[PDB]
């Protein structure tokens, strides 16, 4: 019964279940607003994907794209394997006070299922032939899913300047769990207005958690 | 109830109450062994100190010199205020997999209760002549506390060289509430063995929590 709206919205996460705490005391909360932001010498990461999106679901709170087993990125030299992509809009994340009006996730887990989220933001521009394979096919219900016709490389929707911002935080839906890297891209990728609202319109509202306080943390730019 | 050693000890403080969930569930727990380092572009911390312990506590855990209002340093342009420093042998973080003997905390809070703690290994060397004129007056057993016949300015246990470690982190006691900025001195002080002896006997046992594993985190280094 969470939700991103309403009296089971993100104000009151934390209230509907134990399990759910973490929403309420939690210290280390993504998403942020990306504003205390210091230069540091971080390495590349390492991305490492084939094709292997295969199916599109829409479960109510965003479109989920499942990813086969294989790809991975390399964190701490950690591998982390590629498990699915979502959307959000606007986006999660802001950059000095601003929202892009959307942005994606590209979800990661280690052997021992520790979480790396790569976030991308996307501003209004052409049309991204990528998504448009996506969108296409996109489920309008909570609850369907589709198998996409011919295999997708995540790889594609990355930018090719692959500057980034760290921070350590937490998934951004119930249970908010913490101890995740969060690696987010500083350069936007683009996609149409009518991509956008394509999507906004079968949401059927804003599916953004608002930003938490970033407390004792700082974001380290590449 | 929670202790050092034995059945209340470290292992066992997350199951010893509710309110000290953290200690279990947590995945920005301090201490850590410092050994995931960045070097990042960090500003000096401003530390406006002025001749302020009043007293100190022998509270069972540790040897706690309480200071008066007036100094504070400055993180992120936030003012933390001095609130009291202490102490643990051995270390509680460790460097690059080794512990020093002895270790200060420098604890601060801002007007919203935001913590700062400042963390100075100490290795063993020449007598602390500050040190001493606490160590000539601590008390022997839990619960007693006296008076120090002349104010200590804390600034003189602190390195000249003001390079720094920096994290996000908890307190290392319970309930190890997180959200606390660490600030640890790169710089290492000095003090005798017959001064760590003391300490350790009056204590009766390591005062240190174990490292706690970094997570998604990373270090900065100044
Ligand atoms: C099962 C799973 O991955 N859950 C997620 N919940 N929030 C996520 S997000 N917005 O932080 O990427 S991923
Ligand atoms: C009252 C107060 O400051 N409590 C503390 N508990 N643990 C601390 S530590 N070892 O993280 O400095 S300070
Ligand atoms: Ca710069
Ligand atoms: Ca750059
Ligand atoms: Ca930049
Ligand atoms: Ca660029
Ligand atoms: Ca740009
Ligand atoms: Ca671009
Ligand atoms: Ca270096
Ligand atoms: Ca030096
Ligand atoms: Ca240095
Ligand atoms: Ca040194
Ligand atoms: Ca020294
Ligand atoms: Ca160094
Ligand atoms: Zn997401
Ligand atoms: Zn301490």
Redesign the pocket.
């Given at each position: 019964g969470w939700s991103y709206h309403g009296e089971h919205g993100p104000e009151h996460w934390g209230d509907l279940k134990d399990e759910y705490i973490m929403c309420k005391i939690g210290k280390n909360q993504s998403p942020v607003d990306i504003n205390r932001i210091v230069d540091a010498k971080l390495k590349p990461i390492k991305i490492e994907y084939r094709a292997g999106a295969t199916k599109v679901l829409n479960n109510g709170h965003t479109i989920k794209v499942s990813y086969e087993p294989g790809s991975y990125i390399v964190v701490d030299g950690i591998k982390f394997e590629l498990k699915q992509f979502h959307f959000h809009a606007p986006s999660e994340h802001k950059l000095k006070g601003q929202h892009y009006p959307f942005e994606a996730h590209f979800v990661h887990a280690d052997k021992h299922g520790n979480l790396a989220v790569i976030g991308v933001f996307f501003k209004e521009g052409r049309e991204n032939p990528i998504l448009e394979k996506i969108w296409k096919v996109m489920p309008e219900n909570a609850g369907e899913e589709v198998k996409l016709a011919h295999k997708i490389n995540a790889e594609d929707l990355l930018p090719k300047?692959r500057?980034y911002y760290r921070y350590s935080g937490s998934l951004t839906t119930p249970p908010c769990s913490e101890g995740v890297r969060w690696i987010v891209m500083?350069?936007e990728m683009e996609m149409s207005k009518e991509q956008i609202e394509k999507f906004r319109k079968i949401m059927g509202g804003d599916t953004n958690r608002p930003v938490q306080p970033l407390n004792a943390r700082m974001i380290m730019e590449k």
């Open positions: 300047d500057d500083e350069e």
